[PDB]
Amino acid sequence: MFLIHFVHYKTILQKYTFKFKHIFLSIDKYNSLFFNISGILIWLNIIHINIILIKYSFFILINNFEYLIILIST
Amino acid sequence: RASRTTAEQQREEERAQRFGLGRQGALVQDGGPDQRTLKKHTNDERIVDAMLFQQNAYRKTPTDEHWNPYIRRSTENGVGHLLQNKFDIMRREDRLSKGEQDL
Amino acid sequence: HQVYLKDMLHLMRYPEPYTHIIDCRTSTQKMHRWVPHSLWLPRDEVEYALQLSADEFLDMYGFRKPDKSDDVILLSHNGIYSEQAGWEWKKQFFQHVYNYRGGTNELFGESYSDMNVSDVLSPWKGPFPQSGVFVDKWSKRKVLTRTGPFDRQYEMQDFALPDLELEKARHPEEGPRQNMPFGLQ
Amino acid sequence: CDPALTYKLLGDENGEERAQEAYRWFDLALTSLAVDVPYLPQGTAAASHITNALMRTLLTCGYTHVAAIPDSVYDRMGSMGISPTISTYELVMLALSLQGNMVEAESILSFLRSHHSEHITVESFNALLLGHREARQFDCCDAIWQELVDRRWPRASPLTAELYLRSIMDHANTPTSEPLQSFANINVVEKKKVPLVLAQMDELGVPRTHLSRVLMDEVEDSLRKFQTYRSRFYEWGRAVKQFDFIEFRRRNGWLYDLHLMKCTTKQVGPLRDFNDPDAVQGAVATAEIPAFFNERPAWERPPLEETLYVTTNKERYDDVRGGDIYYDDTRGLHDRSPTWMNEVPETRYDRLYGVNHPDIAKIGIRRHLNVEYVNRK
Amino acid sequence: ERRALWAEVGPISDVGSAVTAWIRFGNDPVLHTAVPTMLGGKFRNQQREKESLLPNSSSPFAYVEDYMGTNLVFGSPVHAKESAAVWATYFERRYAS
Amino acid sequence: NDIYRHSFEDVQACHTQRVTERDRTMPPYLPTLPHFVAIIKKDPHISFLLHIGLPDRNSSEEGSAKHKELEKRIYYLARALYHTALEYHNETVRRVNRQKVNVAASLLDNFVEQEWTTILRDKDTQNDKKQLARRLGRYMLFANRSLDDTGFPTDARADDYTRWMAPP
Amino acid sequence: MLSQNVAKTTVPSYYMIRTNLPHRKPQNQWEGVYYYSGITKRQRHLILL
Amino acid sequence: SFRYTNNLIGALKHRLLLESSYREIASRKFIGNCRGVEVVCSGYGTVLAVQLTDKAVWESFYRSLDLDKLAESIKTALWDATRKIRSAKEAALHRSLSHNTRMRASADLKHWYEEDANTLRPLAFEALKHEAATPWMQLVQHGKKEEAAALLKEFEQKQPPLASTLKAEDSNPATIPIGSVHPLFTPALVQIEEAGGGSVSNEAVCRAQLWELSRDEQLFWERVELIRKGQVASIGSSHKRGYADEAAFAKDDTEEKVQLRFT
Amino acid sequence: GEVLHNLMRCAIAARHRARIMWVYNVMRGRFYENVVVRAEVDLIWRYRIAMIALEYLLDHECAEEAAAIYSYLVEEELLRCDVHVRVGLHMREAIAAGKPITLNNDVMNATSLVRDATAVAPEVARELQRRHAQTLQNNAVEAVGAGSAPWSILGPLTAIGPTAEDTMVWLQQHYGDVDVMSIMRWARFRKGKDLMAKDRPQYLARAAAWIELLSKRNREMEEVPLTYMRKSKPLVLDTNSNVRVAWQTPLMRSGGPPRLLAREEGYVFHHSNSSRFVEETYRHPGESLQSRYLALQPLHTEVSAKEDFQRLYYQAQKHHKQQ
Amino acid sequence: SHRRDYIRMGYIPRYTPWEWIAIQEADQPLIAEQIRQDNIGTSYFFSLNRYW
Amino acid sequence: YPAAVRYGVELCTVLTAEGKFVDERGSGLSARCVVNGTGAAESVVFDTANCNGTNTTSVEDALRVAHGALRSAQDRHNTLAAFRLGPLSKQSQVLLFCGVNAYEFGGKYARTYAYAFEKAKKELEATAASGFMAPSLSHEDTERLSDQPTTSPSVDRFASTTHPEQRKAQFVPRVGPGSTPLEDPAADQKSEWS
Amino acid sequence: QLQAQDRIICGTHGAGIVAHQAPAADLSRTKPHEGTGTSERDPYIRTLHNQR
Amino acid sequence: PFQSNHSLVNKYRGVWIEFDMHPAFSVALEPQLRKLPRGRTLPKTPAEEVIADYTALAPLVDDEKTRDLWLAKVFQHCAFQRCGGAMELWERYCHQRFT
Predict the structure, then answer these.
(1) Residues of A with CB below 8 A from F27's CB?
(2) GO cellular component annotations, sorted alphabetically (chain H) (predicted)?
(3) Looking at the complex, does the CB of residue B83 fall below 8 Å from at least one CB of chain D?
(4) Which residues contact B70 (CB under 8 A, 6 or more apart)?
(5) Is-contact C58 F13, C-beta < 8 A?
(6) From residue M13, how far is each of A73, I29, M18, M71 by CA, in Å?
(7) Is M82 annotated as contributing to ligand binding?
């Protein structure tokens, strides 16, 4: 048995904020310093490709993993 | 009474239009009813529902996440949860009335 | 999330106004008993049912929307359809969706198997699928992957039984594996 | 076992009524003392002792009475002309410290050290420590502790040591703001000072066991975190221990912060400067930046990018020949097959195909079950 | 069900219990029984306007009514008759459906 | 609404909600003028002035005048706070209402401090009026007291409160 | 099954012999040594009890 | 089984502590003394007796005879007594709030200001129907029903005023009935408790829950049968299409690749 | 227990109280030693070690150490161990006979040492009263800097009644919280020779000093009367921040208007190393160009930062009877 | 941590920031033998002998 | 309804009532006092003009007259408050006694309300015996697994109780301050310090 | 000896070199290190230290 | 958490009995208790000797707690010696009133 018909009131006001970042916002990524590259010399026992525009400006980088490559003013 | 009901309908339709409430297209689509085109910087029912879910997410009490001491002492939402005794409450009230930085 | 037999019995004895116990069982010919405080929202209709408005849902299902904030607990046979429906509820962003694993089947001690699925798989009669072929990113060699004819499911279903007297029945006498050399067993 | 919390909680034990009773008892005690020429009742040892007792019993009442002690009780004693004592100064210092007002609690101790030296007892230092702990002035609390350990005559009490340790541990647990909270919390370093304090307590003769067990649990936590011995340091660097830690992290499913087990695939390209776009740029180094240094700003990001879209970073099975070997897929959470209607069993809603705004009430079920049906529409 | 059987009596059967409950609710037997009652915005002077359709009772517990207006218990004879008629119509429609 | 009624099944389905005492029902601290005046008079200094601090209202004609002016100022402050609580949702009028709140609080504080000075300056043992007045606190002012929509101190920070309530 | 356990080493081939790519990550000097300073759940429960 | 029930438990323990405090205050006498005069009042704030301690000391002070000074002293003593009553009233609430942590789950600070001394029990405008009442009524308003019945039977056969009824052991929170623990919904919490004595009657609540559950069972079965009728009317037959089973495993296509031809 | 007792004996011989406290701490031990390795010292050995620690510490005026060790003793109720061991020694012979009854109160009191302490207690009370009276008189004399002072009159000490029950209850009425019976039983047996059956005054002084050191209430009772610190306010004509206007009590002020209390008129505690206290009055500007245009010249009369009520009363006492 | 133009734009700090200093200091424990506290005299007899 | 009852119990708190008392001992001296509500103490006054010119009135008689005046004023104020609150009190009682079905404690949840009340009633003594320290709101002091009820948050609800990476509240695990595992807290990193 | 040092450095969120001059939220619980950027007393980034 | 491959070397590795009696009773029974096991110290006295001492001296000492502790020590000693004859002591003393 019921007697009174009434409207429904609810306090949907949370008035609160909860922010928690996920790990994928923190997982590291590769970053590097960039400079205007002035050419690459790919050297081997005999064969060497030589792509150079201008001379070295400040410093010269060397990578030897598959092909010995010297980047000039990179 | 008619004006009261009309005002209620006006309020609800204004809220729905402002928040993008309701379905986007027909009830039954070719691939399903849950197909919406979330335009950038446009409010939507899916966005408000996602916001509420992300904020609550099986939350029992606001203090449920407050097991970590840094979370407990963070005062981003407020400082009510850090007052646990009438002495502290009255001291804070006295200092704020005096016009000093709250401890 | 989970809800257990103790919680279900406690809810049956002492109910609360804002925990909707949804009985998401299809094929009404199978269901016989009524779980207490339960409301019928079948999983085959939940996808459209959750899209309706408050009155739009009330005038069609005889009860109002769970308000997307109240707790909902889903029951079905073996807890399979209940889990599938809870997926849809979570996709609709309901805050508290719980599944009762075992459902009415374990609650009433009957044996109903909705979504009849066999744990074992038929042997892979075809060749190794192309989708599982892996090519090296440096040497460009073709490499395999645990899929298709051979994978973890096949290994698990082939694994030995926990009972020794049942295990000895499978393998023949004088060793479990003799098709292979002594040092490779 | 927190003295500050004891003082804060004893007020709720009907402090105001007990304070009024104490005031009445003090008044009648003065009347009964007057019957022991124009100065004897005012200036005597008994009057000062009674005033000290009144201050001590008012210390345990509510905030109103402890705030009224230093400005009402002290001033009334001065007006009556009762000579105060070191206990009186200690109690007024404690009253000023409990309310967080340390600017005056320091000045009164300065007066005591200037004019009434070689009379300061230990309790002044713990009063100042309690006030600083309540006022969140842990740097000044450390300064006072160092002054005490340089003095060594006040003979630092177990309570004083406990107060300083509790202050430093509270400072350790206090979090910083978000710019300092982007990495791990930096205030946890404050627990490293605990072994130093324990060694200084050993030198000062303060017993270690007199500390409360609640404090001792956290003290042992900080010791197990920052107190490795040399003998165990000779062996903590090995392979078995590190790999066991790796196995524990794998078992608990947290391998995002391990050098050996984490391989990073994402790379960030250069920025095309508009000053001179002719020149091309090449990398000269490589760094493991935590990826929140260079994030996509929020306004050019999909909405919250977490619940709406599920993203998995997998690897191509075809020959890459150069490119992103590990690429991520971004599928919407609510995504379904374009032909889901016929792949799911047919239901009651199939008859509503193509209608923009169907009148669901006509197909509604409640109409037949309720005989008094009426449409809000 | 084996412990909660048929309800032999209501919550308060005897008027001896009713007076106890009335006092227990927090009502003073003098002032609460002496405050006047208002019907339709008037204090029911002139002895409740002499004869009235409603009984001259001060307690609204005498005036309690079901939501549909069907007080078939302790009500007027004609009121109970029409309430029974309303219930019969509603239930016959529901069972016909 | 007394003559006519809703549907029986409508009310039957409506009663399934079972309004909860914690959040579903309306809070007991709804903003009302008697509530605001009660919480204003709850202050120990205000109560002291109302009861013993002022001279007897029926004794001297000046006592009655001071009492009626003090209660007028208290009523003004309570009504200003009540209007602020009512219009607390929108901020266009909240600031201009808080200006009236500030003015009323300043008037009340000025009167209270003047009366406290005079009742401590006017010209002994066993808990007399002057001893009780000195035993009371320092009269936390109302002109710089934080309240929000309920007459209670806010749980937000001082910066948040002072940016909520600032002149337009 | 865990989604974090990935392939650190490349599939065996002749690159590992004919190229100068190192087969292990160089040591990170800034990352400290892993040591054990935790509390188990039963230990915490026993302390509270 | 995690939010509503736990929050209700916290609220009910808080209200039990408040009701025990109400009993303690109502069964106590507070003495407020200002100069010569002293006023003893009950827990409701009603004056029980005004006396003058130290008559020899204060006769010269109060002196013809002075009236305004005596009146102001009496008023000060009465205000002191009322202030002490309100201070104890608030202190009990503060203790309950500080010792109850389920109220600390909600970060709101208003739980401290919601129940100030004005809005707590007992009340000064409520003492007439309690103190002036006969002991039978006084103890029947407090939930003790067996004692009330025994006293009524004895009567029909033949210092604070509430000290006789509200005993020291009555302040124990384990003696508070459901009807009296929450003074707000007392008529609604009277039905649940048993008619004989003050205790929970599980029979009544089981009966009500069982009746409601039977009604809901009939409604549910009607609803589900109507839904199934709608289903079978909407679609042709009662059969239902099966679901495709999601599996990470690949599929074998040789069966569909193989076809026949004639030679 | 024997090893730790020897360690503490060596520390006492070396006169190293820091190492004495360290060995007491290691005797108490911690969780790891007490419950994991299960290597804890015997209870009687703990009592003996703590007792010898007290004997060394609190006859050299080590108040904090004595208080710490006594708090440890009362934490686990080791005060009556010296009579428990005696009744156990008696039960050593009693077990060679019938019925070694339990530790009744009468059986405990039947021992000789407790009866001797009860007999000696009135002398201890008399010595305490005399020493406190002399200390109070000396404090008054050193406060006035001469000789009679109002401080020495009506001290916080009550006259004793010539009855044994009143004498016994006076110890509880004044100290009450140090177990004077157990202190008077510990005071005897100095280096193996008891003092009750020997020179009394040394024992009386030792017991009185022990009670005075252990009783915190006694420490609060006997204190040197300090001086009333004066509050200060910043100058209206702010010429400097170190100098402040001091507040003068009505006792010091011969006249002055009926001012309110210090806090009400505005005064706070401020004092530093380089601080001075003054009374500020600006020079009255006579009507001229300087008054019309130039700012007022302040005038600060330097006053003391402290006021000594004891010396003020001492001066008035002999300023009155001289007339 | 707020330096958006880091590494990519050629910004590499000359001085290690206080946040990183505190992080690295708090990551590792402290050796208890580095306090080298001494209160009692040297042991001439037993300290050298000790246990094998 | 709760707002209405709060208004009713708050209005008479600030409202006041005046009372009079004339001495019955033959002396004409009377006493008039305006008593307040809950803070039942406000202005009082004696009128010595009414009594005879002898003015032979005892201080005890004056105290008795003041007592009578205060008692009369307080009972008048109580009667005024009862008259103010009665008409609404009866309607509130009728509403609560009739519309019980639409309440938490009225319908099928009456058993839940009784169970919660009994549990709180029983746990109050447990807290008192444990020293008013709120004994582990999160049930961890329970020496037995059967001791902790089924309503405690301590019982896990995550799927795959033995597998990590699935014991997450949301679709992706989240980190709080720094990079702490907020989703599944470990024993060491959670503390009840202060 | 900078002039008005207390107001410029210890009193201004911009240190005297920041010109603080979608609407701002009405009732917002802003973070301790941020603000709505309405005026100087409520800058977008707060500079004054919360400590003493 | 610290999980060590090697077991804790300093572990007691046994059942502890929490022996704690009144100091007077302990020193009185010291001549008898020397034969009973002490903390990590186990005398090799014959078990029948201590059993006879207990059965001959227990009625003399009037303390239920002391008797219980003494019987517990007797049980511990006879368990260390693996002497099965001591159950008669339990049936003589404890069985009538404890279970």
Answers:
(1) 11
(2) mitochondrial small ribosomal subunit; mitochondrion
(3) no
(4) D173, D174, D175, D181, D185, K176, K177
(5) yes
(6) 70, 20, 15, 22
(7) yes
